[PDB]
Each structure stands twice: as structure tokens, then as C-alpha cells.
Design a protein around this ligand. Structure first.
Ligand code: HEC
Length: 461
């Protein structure tokens, strides 16, 4: 399986660098084809580039490519596996459980949707506190997705001033800061350095364990007041899954694994949604024509009176296109999360041995030159036909694809749709640095893009 010849100890780092590694992968694909080999120091990585290879692996050999693969830093920073990093029956069975409970009406009288709607009108209330004055939305937008997960795991959101909530928030955001430092790919190239610089990974381990404790005291309060035959949140359903398993007791569901699945949901369920929303508003500032068009659909379909809901989305194609086009443009997980093969397998006639790490290039699919003609340009017509109707694409994979597809695809769709429409129904976004100037080009470091810093005022309508 071809690829550039790597140097003695520094792997392929001269060829890919430490900057925008997804761009380097596209360039390498131009010379080695859609299936190349790449060395992260001494570790052999198969990269899959265009749609055809990604679809052929993740969908057609779905089981064979179902494995999760772990780079050095994550290996050291993770004590205990839940869902994101699990493999085999542990992953198969917890993931299955989690999707069950993440369905709209999958645990109690309260739906996921009602959770997201409650959050939407609190999000709006807090933005109303900003008194139409310049503000960095990073924090407020960060709280809403975290709080949806709080409500899903604990039945009950927290006021945004609740100190339980701010600690969990502080702990989650610090993990995102540590993890966005450019010299994180330096660890994956030279893992020896983890020992010589353990600051990173010790801070991750300390933060996770803080969160694990907090959750533990939560599942205790649950074990106490828990009504079987009447589960109301994630913890309840897990606790009672433990009872239906307490007999045949090898057993994948335990207090350890619930803590682990819980921290994952918080980590996987906060950062990406938060950034997508922050980036959405940035783009809505830059392109006010687009914003004006979304507001016409809101006044027409939903009033100014009631609150949005999911049934409204089928009747709002432009807004569905904007949401779709934010996710595709911004390409927040350029190489999703590293995959790994389940056994020795010939792929496009190449032979790839069991447990070999795979990087899926989601960028190559999301920014396919042909499906999306100006792919590095923000344009909702990418998902509209000549009438105003919504136009699906099989190249829309920001949640990846196949057997490891984001467990929260639906939830994220609800959050994005309901928080964005809720914000634009209630406010007009005013820029302070004038649309024309401000730059919306992703700041990329390794496998993580983020918008540049901006401010805006939320002026009520
Ligand atoms: C449930 C809360 C939750 C929310 C909200 C959420 N995710 Fe996820 N996402 C997950 C979990 C859990 C996984 C792990 C799946 C697995 O390993 O089997 C995941 C995995 C992924 C992967 C894994 C890639 C792969 O092939 O293995 C990508 C890409 C991803 N998410 C993107 C997103 C994007 C983009 C958003 C929103 C803009 C988002 N997720 C919002 C829970 C969430």
C-alpha cells in the first residue's frame, strides 16, 4: 500500500507537518492515489481519501472498518473505555444501548426534543441578558449543548450559574484547550516525549477523573431514588440495564462503564456542537442576505409567537440548507476519529493487517470539487435545487458514516436547527467590525478546526 518513504526516526513528518495536516493529505493523495500509507514516527497509518474509497471502506466493508484506533496521546490520557474508544463487544453493546436511549422517546415521558426546546428558550433568555452589547458568544453557546447532555444524563438541566454546572463546564473547556495545542501531534509522532513532558495527559487524566467522581455522586443519588419501570434519564436506564444483566455476570454494563460512557457523551456532545453554532453565527454575520432569507422562512412557517420545533424543518428548506452548509464548509473533524481494521483484509487489492490504524479524510468528501463546485466557499445553494427545495447529498458526512457514525447525529441536528432558528427568531445579529472585512477562514491545528475570534450584539426584533 504505497506512500512516501519515511525518514529514520521522524516518520513522514516533513511531508505532512504539524500545521493543517488535512491539506497535506489531499496533496499526498494527488501523488499516491486514494489509498496511501503514512508514518507517524514509526506507526503505519493507511489514509483513505475520496468519497469512493471512504464509502467502499466505511459502508461496504463496514464491519471490517468498525474498529476505533488510538494515537499515543489518547492511549495515555484515557483510563477506562466507554463508547468513543471501546472496541469489540464492549463497544458493540454499549453503543447499541446508547442509541436506544438517545431516541426521541427512548427513556421516559420527556422527549429529547423537549429537552432541546427548553434549552433553546433559556439560550434566548441568556442572550437577552447581553443587553444588545458586544459579546463573545463562545461561553453562552458552549453551555447550551453541555446542558442538553446534563438534562439527558441527569433528567434535569442546571441554571447556568449553578456551580455544579460551571465546574463541569470549566473542566470540559480546559480539555479542549489542552487538546488544541499544536504540539499534540508532536506527541503522536514521537511518543517518547509523553514521558519527558507529562503535563499534557496528566491534566487530561485529572480532569476526566474529576468528572468521573462528579458523575459517580450523581448515580448514587439515582441508585437511591430510582424507580424501576419508570426510568427518566440515561443513568436510570443504565442502572436498570445492570439489573437485567446482574445474572449472566461477565457483563459490559457496570458503574465503571457508565462513568466512562457519561464522560464521553459530555466530551463528544459539547465541543463540536458548540463550535458549529459559534461558526454558524460568524457566517450569518458575514452573509446577512442569507440571514435575512432564514428570517423570512421563520416568520412565515413559525410565528414570532411560538417556539420552533422539528416538524417545522421539512417546511423550511433554506434554513435546512444553511445548517447543512455550515457543517460541510467548516469541516470540524477533517479526519473524523481514527479508525482501525478488525482483521487482515485486502482493500482495493492492497492487504491491510488487523489493527492497522485508518484515517478517513472527511474533508475530501465534504469539499469534493465536483459535488460542491466552489467547495471552499460558503453557499447554501450547495444544498438547494433551482426552486427553493432542499437537496440532499451523499457527500454530506460531517458525522462520518457506517458503523461508527456519530451516536448523536439526530441530537445535534435538533440542537443546531432549534437553537439557530430560536436565535434568529428573537434577534438580529449585529457585527461591530463590518461584514466585508472579517475573515471566516478556519484556524486549523492537526485534526481540529475552529473559527477565529469575533464579537457580536444580539439585538431583539
Ligand atoms: C451524544 C452526544 C453527541 C453530540 C451532541 C454530538 N456527538 Fe459526534 N459523536 C458522539 C459519540 C458518542 C461518538 C462516538 C461513536 C463511536 O465511537 O462509536 C461521536 C463520534 C463522532 C465522529 C466519529 C467519527 C468516526 O467515524 O468514528 C464524528 C466525525 C462526529 N462525532 C461528529 C459530530 C459533529 C459534527 C457534531 C455536531 C456539530 C457531533 N458529532 C455532536 C456523540 C455526540
Amino acid at each position: 500500500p504505497p506512500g512516501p518513504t519515511p525518514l529514520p526516526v521522524i516518520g513522514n513528518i516533513l511531508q505532512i507537518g504539524i500545521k493543517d495536516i488535512s491539506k497535506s493529505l489531499t496533496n499526498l493523495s494527488k501523488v499516491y492515489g486514494p489509498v496511501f500509507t503514512l508514518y507517524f514516527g514509526l506507526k503505519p497509518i493507511v489514509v483513505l481519501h475520496g468519497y469512493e474509497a471512504v464509502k467502499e471502506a466505511l459502508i461496504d466493508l463496514g464491519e471490517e472498518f468498525s474498529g476505533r484506533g488510538i494515537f499515543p496521546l489518547a492511549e495515555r490520557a484515557n483510563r477506562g473505555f466507554g463508547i468513543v474508544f471501546s472496541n469489540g463487544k464492549k463497544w458493540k453493546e454499549i453503543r447499541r444501548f446508547s442509541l436506544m436511549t438517545l431516541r426521541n422517546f427512548g427513556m421516559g415521558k420527556r422527549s429529547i426534543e423537549d429537552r432541546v426546546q427548553e434549552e433553546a428558550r433559556c439560550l434566548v433568555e441568556e442572550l437577552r441578558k447581553t443587553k444588545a452589547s458586544p459579546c463573545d458568544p463562545t461561553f453562552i453557546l458552549g453551555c447550551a449543548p453541555c446542558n442538553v447532555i446534563c438534562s439527558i444524563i441527569f433528567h434535569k438541566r442546571f441554571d447556568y450559574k449553578d456551580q455544579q454546572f460551571l465546574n463541569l463546564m470549566e473542566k470540559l473547556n480546559e480539555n479542549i484547550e489542552i487538546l488544541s495545542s499544536p504540539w499534540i501531534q508532536v506527541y503522536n509522532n514521537f511518543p517518547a516525549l509523553l514521558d519527558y513532558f507529562p503535563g499534557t495527559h496528566n491534566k487530561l487524566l485529572k480532569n476526566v477523573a474529576f468528572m468521573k467522581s462528579y458523575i459517580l455522586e450523581k448515580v448514587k443519588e439515582h441508585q437511591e431514588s430510582m424507580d424501576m419501570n419508570n426510568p427518566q434519564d440515561f443513568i436510570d436506564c443504565f442502572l436498570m440495564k445492570m439489573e437485567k444483566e446482574k445474572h449472566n455476570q461477565p457483563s459490559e454494563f457496570t458503574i465503571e462503564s457508565l462513568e466512562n460512557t457519561a464522560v464521553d457523551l459530555f466530551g463528544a456532545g459539547t465541543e463540536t456542537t458548540s463550535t458549529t453554532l459559534r461558526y454558524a453565527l460568524l457566517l450569518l454575520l458575514k452573509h446577512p442576505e442569507v440571514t435575512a432569507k432564514v428570517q423570512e422562512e421563520i416568520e412565515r412557517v413559525i410565528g414570532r409567537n411560538r417556539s420552533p420545533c422539528m416538524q417545522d424543518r421539512s417546511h423550511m428548506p433554506y434554513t435546512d440548507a444553511v445548517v447543512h452548509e455550515v457543517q460541510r464548509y467548516i469541516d470540524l473533524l477533517p479526519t473524523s476519529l481514527p479508525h482501525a481494521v478488525t482483521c487482515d483484509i485486502k482493500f482495493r487489492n492492497y492487504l491491510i493487517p488487523k489493527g492497522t490504524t485508518i484515517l478517513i479524510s472527511l474533508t475530501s468528501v465534504l469539499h469534493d470539487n465536483k459535488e460542491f463546485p466552489n467547495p471552499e466557499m460558503f453557499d447554501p445553494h450547495h444544498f438547494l435545487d433551482e426552486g427553493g427545495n432542499f437537496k440532499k447529498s451523499k457527500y454530506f458526512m460531517p458525522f462520518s458514516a457506517g458503523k461508527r457514525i456519530c451516536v448523536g447525529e439526530a441530537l445535534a441536528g435538533m440542537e443546531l436547527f432549534l437553537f439557530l432558528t430560536s436565535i434568529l427568531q428573537n434577534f438580529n445579529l449585529k457585527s461591530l467590525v463590518d461584514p466585508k472585512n472579517l475573515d471566516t477562514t478556519p484556524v486549523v491545528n492537526g485534526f481540529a478546526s475552529v473559527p477565529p475570534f469575533y464579537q457580536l450584539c444580539f439585538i431583539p426584533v
